[PDB]
Design a protein around this ligand. Structure first.
Ligand SMILES: O=[N+]([O-])c1cc(-c2noc(C3CCC3)n2)ccc1NCCCCCCN1C[C@H](O)[C@@H](O)[C@H](O)[C@H]1CO
Length: 765
């Protein structure tokens, strides 16, 4: 029965607008298959369209904003795009229609409305670009009756092993289509929908912009050769209209020019399903998906006081939809240094210079292919999987649809190599690579990242202990399906745990170091003079200079998170021998957190190094790092140390701002220095962990119950209101927030763990 859910999940999830790197496109969860994408741009001159055309996501002064108003990857949703440059408010509605054997059907409506500023007679070029990869697959544009192009719909018929037979229609649409009275119209037509059917080697089909422009340039070259010139030139929009040439190929460009408002549909009909998809079908499924979305949100994300107001519901729906709407399918080779150069063991003083030397060998090479199905932090700036980010992304998503979240965990775990490594940053295929400087592509098998995905697993486990609707919870409602999932994953979890212990081990046994355990001690590999990227907290201050005897309290805590998870899941599976080992590791981490990292003098946890004199030294820098054993759920509720941390947490002159907790204390000498990334600003992911843990102390008999209850109340309020106010003013989720001004800063469209705010509002942890 397990593989029954599995099959239904696969069929449910296969199609999606799973290209969050572009404004709008579709692809299925198959490496080499059919992909679509949308392009549009005003044209007002002979040279403007190249600068105005939109395709890949960006965020600059020319774009007011854009994002998903509703979305569920099983059903589809609606996206809004507000484009200042092209004077256009666009809606793209996408809906899936279950059926047949090939993952069903889908449909999209593209609606564009000129805004108030745009010339009412604006000419907007619109392209629907379709490509198919695979050796034994075919796709063909049925030619038009009319001479120079299409008066009605464009029908592509295609076939592949993966999709069986299918038709993809781009409808005639509604809106004025301009008409040219130039001489050229005798050869090019007065103006109509056109199709070019082309073929290129499979691996470049993703390069839609250049492919398109190469075609436009050949049309213009043809104008020149054929005596169309500046003495009497055709209008711009006709100069940029491709000559109609439909046929068969692995690329099909469908182009329309509109004057004023426009709309058209795309209907993908799987032959193996019922009858084919119509526009009436699209409208009906669109209405139905909203109703369903509406009802799930109010049940799953029931906002509690003082956020019950409709303004906060709208806010929550925006933050949620953007997070789950960023879900992508990525496919291809990634770039990995597999030298395991000895310099990467970072055993010497000065190891960062050695490691640079090894990086200068450039032994990295492409490997795979791999696939990933994942949510992403940022459509415009980093539309790809990041390992500890996904732990945060899946917490609201798991509420919504636990089976989807397990899907994404499974996809991430399927990347793990034989040693237990998963690269922190998944840049799959040339399309993904295009967005990323060559110097930052290389992944390193010695680089860890926080195992925040175990948090999602912990949530799953609690739920397991205590048709699209049915499917979304199948893995918790069917206990045996749940345990079977956990059974197949468990070895990989254990693999990762061991990998942490082998690759990120700290050195106790060879300095003057006394502690309950000789084993438990950890140091993040990959540290430079000013950075520790693998920790997730890029530039939070660490011992200077970096040193092979460093120990990092955040890393030990993460290992604590992992043991606790392995205990639960191990118990569920009866791995009795494993559970006893874990039990002793936990007990050891508990003692060793204190013996190696507790500072009585400072009242908080600290990273440690070894002195110029060769002795163990704590290096205390009050901020997120300092609260780690607390944030990761490792302290007993009665713990005096906890109490001291609650004081640090609440102290306005250290961490507590009106806007959330400061990454670093105002008292720290590194406050607001250098790039100031993790050296003062307020970060929603760490604030979320604080909030969940405060709530935990607050809902149990103990000495800090009422302190935690007050801090919980205030911090929930602070964090939610800061994120909300910024969204209200700017339309955006931001990456971090300024503790002096409350302004969002760094990157916009960060959905992205900022969206945790929906879970903070809905509460009851
Ligand atoms: O495309 N870009 O090169 C690019 C461009 C801009 C940019 N800003 O403005 C503009 C112009 C002017 C207006 C438009 N461009 C900003 C960033 C990037 N790329 C950075 C790649 C790595 C990001 C990691 C984020 N984050 C760090 C955290 O610390 C980790 O913890 C966490 O895991 C990780 C993932 O969330």
């Amino acid at each position: 029965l397990h593989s029954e859910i599995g099959r239904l999940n696969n069929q449910s999830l296969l199609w999606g607008p799973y290209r969050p790197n572009i404004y709008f496109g579709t692809r299925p969860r198959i490496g080499k298959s059919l992909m679509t994408g949308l392009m549009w741009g005003k044209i007002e001159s002979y040279t403007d369209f190249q600068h105005t055309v939109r395709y890949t996501c960006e965020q600059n002064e020319g774009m007011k904003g854009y994002g998903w108003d509703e979305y569920d990857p099983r059903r589809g949703g609606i996206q809004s795009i507000h484009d200042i440059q092209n004077g256009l408010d666009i809606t793209t509605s996408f809906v899936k229609i279950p059926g047949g054997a090939h993952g069903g059907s889908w449909a999209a409506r593209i609606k564009g409305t000129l805004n108030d500023d745009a010339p009412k007679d604006q000419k907007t070029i619109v392209v629907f670009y379709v490509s198919q990869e695979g050796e034994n697959s075919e796709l063909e544009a049925v030619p038009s009756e009319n001479e120079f192009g299409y008066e009605g719909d464009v029908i592509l018929k295609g076939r592949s092993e993966a999709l069986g037979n299918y038709k993809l229609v781009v409808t005639k649409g509604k809106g004025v289509i301009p008409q040219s009275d130039h001489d050229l119209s005798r050869l090019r037509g007065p103006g109509q929908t056109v199709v070019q059917s082309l073929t290129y080697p499979d691996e470049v089909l993703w390069q839609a912009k250049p492919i398109l422009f190469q075609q436009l340039k050949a049309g213009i070259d043809w104008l020149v050769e054929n005596k169309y010139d500046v003495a009497d030139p055709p209008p711009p929009w006709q100069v940029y209209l491709l000559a109609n040439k439909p046929g068969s190929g692995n690329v099909h460009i469908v182009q329309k020019v509109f004057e004023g408002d426009f709309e058209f549909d795309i209907l993908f009909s799987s032959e193996s399903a019922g009858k084919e998809v119509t526009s009436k079908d699209l409208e009906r499924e669109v209405k139905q998906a909203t109703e369903v979305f509406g009802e799930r949100f109010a049940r799953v994300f029931d906002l509690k006081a003082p956020f019950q107001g409709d303004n906060y519901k709208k806010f929550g729906k925006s933050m949620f939809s953007n997070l789950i709407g960023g879900i992508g399918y990525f496919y291809g080779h990634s770039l990995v240094d597999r030298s395991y150069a000895p310099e990467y063991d970072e055993e010497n003083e000065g190891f960062w210079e050695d490691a640079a030397e090894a990086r200068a060998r450039h032994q990295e090479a492409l490997e795979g292919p791999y696939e990933l199905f994942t949510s992403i932090p940022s459509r415009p700036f980093f539309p790809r999987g990041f390992l500890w980010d996904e732990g945060f992304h899946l917490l609201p998503i798991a509420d919504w649809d636990i089976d989807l979240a397990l899907e994404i965990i499974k996809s991430w775990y399927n990347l793990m190599d034989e040693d237990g490594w998963i690269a922190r940053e998944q840049i799959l295929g040339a399309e993904a690579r295009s967005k990323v400087p060559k110097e930052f592509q290389t992944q390193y098998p010695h680089y860890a990242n926080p195992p925040t995905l175990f948090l999602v697993l912990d949530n799953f486990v609690e739920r397991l202990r205590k048709l699209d609707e049915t499917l979304s919870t199948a893995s918790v409602d069917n206990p045996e399906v749940g345990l079977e999932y956990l059974r197949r994953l468990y070895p990989l979890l254990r693999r990762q745990f061991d990998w942490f212990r082998k690759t990120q081990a700290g050195d106790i046994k060879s300095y003057d170091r006394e502690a309950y355990s000789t084993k438990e001690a950890y140091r993040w590999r990959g540290r430079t003079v000013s950075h520790c990227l693998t920790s997730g907290l890029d530039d939070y201050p660490r011992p200077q200079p970096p040193h092979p005897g460093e120990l990092h309290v955040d890393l030990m805590s993460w290992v604590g998170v992992m043991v606790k998870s392995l205990i639960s899941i191990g118990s569920l599976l009866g791995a009795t021998e494993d559970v006893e080992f874990y039990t002793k590791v936990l007990d050891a981490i508990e003692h060793n957190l204190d013996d190696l990292h507790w500072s009585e003098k400072e009242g908080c946890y600290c990273d440690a190094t070894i002195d110029e004199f060769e002795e163990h030294k704590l290096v205390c820098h009050k901020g997120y790092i300092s609260l780690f054993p607390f944030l990761t759920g490792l302290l007993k509720p009665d713990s005096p140390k906890l109490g001291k941390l609650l004081a640090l947490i609440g102290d306005e002159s250290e961490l507590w701002s009106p806007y959330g907790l400061r990454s670093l204390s105002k008292k720290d000498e590194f406050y607001g220095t250098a790039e100031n990334y993790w050296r003062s600003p307020v970060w929603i992911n760490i604030n979320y962990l604080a909030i969940v843990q405060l709530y935990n102390i607050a809902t149990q008999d103990g000495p800090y119950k009422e302190t935690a209850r007050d801090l919980y109340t205030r911090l929930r309020k602070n964090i939610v209101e800061t994120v909300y106010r910024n969204w209200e003013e700017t339309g955006f989720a931001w990456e971090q927030y300024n503790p002096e001004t409350g302004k969002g800063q760094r990157t916009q469209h960060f959905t992205g763990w900022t969206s945790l705010v929906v879970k903070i509002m809905s509460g009851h942890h």
